[PDB]
Amino acid sequence: APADRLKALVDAAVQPVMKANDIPGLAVAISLKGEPHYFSYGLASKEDGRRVTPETLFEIGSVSKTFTATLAGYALTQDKMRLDDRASQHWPALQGSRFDGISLLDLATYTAGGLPLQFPDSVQKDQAQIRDYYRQWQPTYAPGSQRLYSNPSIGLFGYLAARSLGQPFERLMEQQVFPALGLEQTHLDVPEAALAQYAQGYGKDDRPLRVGPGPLDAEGYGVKTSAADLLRFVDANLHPERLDRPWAQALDATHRGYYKVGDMTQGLGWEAYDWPISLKRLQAGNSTPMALQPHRIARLPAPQALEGQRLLNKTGSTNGFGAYVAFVPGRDLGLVILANRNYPNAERVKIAYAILSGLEQ
Numbered sequence: 437a438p439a440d441r442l443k444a445l446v447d448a449a450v451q452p453v454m455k456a457n458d459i460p461g462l463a464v465a466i467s468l469k470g471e472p473h474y475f476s477y478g479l480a481s482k483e484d485g486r487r488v489t490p491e492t493l494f495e496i497g498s499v500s501k502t503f504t505a506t507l508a509g510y511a512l513t514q515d516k517m518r519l520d521d522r523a524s525q526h527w528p529a530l531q532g533s534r535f536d537g538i539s540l541l542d543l544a545t546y547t548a549g550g551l552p553l554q555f556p557d558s559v560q561k562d563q564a565q566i567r568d569y570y571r572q573w574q575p576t577y578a579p580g581s582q583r584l585y586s587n588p589s590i591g592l593f594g595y596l597a598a599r600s601l602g603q604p605f606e607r608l609m610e611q612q613v614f615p616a617l618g619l620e621q622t623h624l625d626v627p628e629a630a631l632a633q634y635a636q637g638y639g640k641d642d643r644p645l646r647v648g649p650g651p652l653d654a655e656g657y658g659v660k661t662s663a664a665d666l667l668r669f670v671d672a673n674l675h676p677e678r679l680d681r682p683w684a685q686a687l688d689a690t691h692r693g694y695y696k697v698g699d700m701t702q703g704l705g706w707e708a709y710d711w712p713i714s715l716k717r718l719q720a721g722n723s724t725p726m727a728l729q730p731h732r733i734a735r736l737p738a739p740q741a742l743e744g745q746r747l748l749n750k751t752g753s754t755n756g757f758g759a760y761v762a763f764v765p766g767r768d769l770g771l772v773i774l775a776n777r778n779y780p781n782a783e784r785v786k787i788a789y790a791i792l793s794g795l796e797q
């Protein structure tokens with residue numbers, strides 16, 4: 437009855453949304469009572485007929501920020517940086533710029549003062565162009581006052597955490613972070629030998645779409661991973677104490693809330709809500725205006741533990757993909773939903789919420 441019931445519940449949550457959004461392929465992984473459960477739907481590639489499995493690689497877009505946060509959490513534990521450091525402390529090129537007056541925490545939590553959603557199209561994947569971009573940038577408003585969701589913001593945070601560790605960001609993820617987390621199906625640059633696992637992404641008129649190079653891509657949106665590996669990452673988040681101390685502490689650092697905007701508490705990478713909360717409120721927290729518009733923050737008196745009866749989540753998209761991850765620390769429950777179409781966040785959250793509410797019922 438239990439396996440039948442879980443299958444029935446996940447099918448009932450996924451299938452209508454998959455169909456309504458014409459999603460070619462979709463992978464679900466659920467961590468429940470200390471055990472993983474995988475559900476795979478449809479096609480990784482419509483053209484060659486490869487089916488989705490729990491090992492299929494999907495682009496996870498902005499979910500990458502949680503890995504980026506974990507690297508920064510590590511740097512914090514290596515006493516290599518502090519959240520209250522000025523950004524320019526970690527890149528001499530920034531000394532004398534406005535980044536003298538902006539903290540690593542401001543950068544990590546999108547409150548640096550109006551850094552935009554993306555780098556302008558004129559900024560290529562080029563260290564000098566990136567450096568020059570930040571040198572010339574001026575805040576629209578005071579640092580620490582307004583949240584404006586931003587790839588350049590947390591991208592810089594990740595880049596400076598890597599600088600504090602004395603190695604390139606990409607090398608650190610591949611050589612240290614992913615191995616420390618036990619992740620062998622998680623990549624910034626998918627190896628040729630693994631390309632057969634990499635799903636095709638689909639956009640309008642089913643044009644094929646995979647993510648191309650961009651400035652600070654690895655930091656903001658560049659990770660490709662499987663449902664099985666992303667769930668392993670969720671289980672690491674549920675049980676940091678199962679890893680060696682330095683990496684336990686790194687994960688813990690991403691479970692700390694610094695301010696609220698409406699129902700959402702902003703951590704490093706992770707965004708948190710009280711649990712339970714209505715589907716409509718969770719949808720609103722992950723809505724377009726939350727990503728695209730500035731919001732005045734309500735700063736907490738002290739960092740808040742993001743644990744117990746809370747839902748921690750992150751959405752992520754690329755041109756061709758749509759990912760969502762959610763977990764409830766106090767219930768030892770986690771879920772991953774990866775699709776090879778960018779479909780609205782509200783729809784991803786709807787699937788997740790249907791699964792979570794069915795599990796409690």
Ligand SMILES: *C(=O)N1C[C@H](NOS(=O)(=O)O)CC[C@H]1C(=O)NC1CCNCC1
Nearest residue numbers: 497498499657722727751752753754755
């Ligand atoms: C994350 O997936 N990003 C950044 C931002 N996230 O807002 S959210 O509510 O979707 O998580 C916007 C979309 C996405 C992003 O950076 N997409 C880019 C499209 C163009 N190619 C580079 C990735």
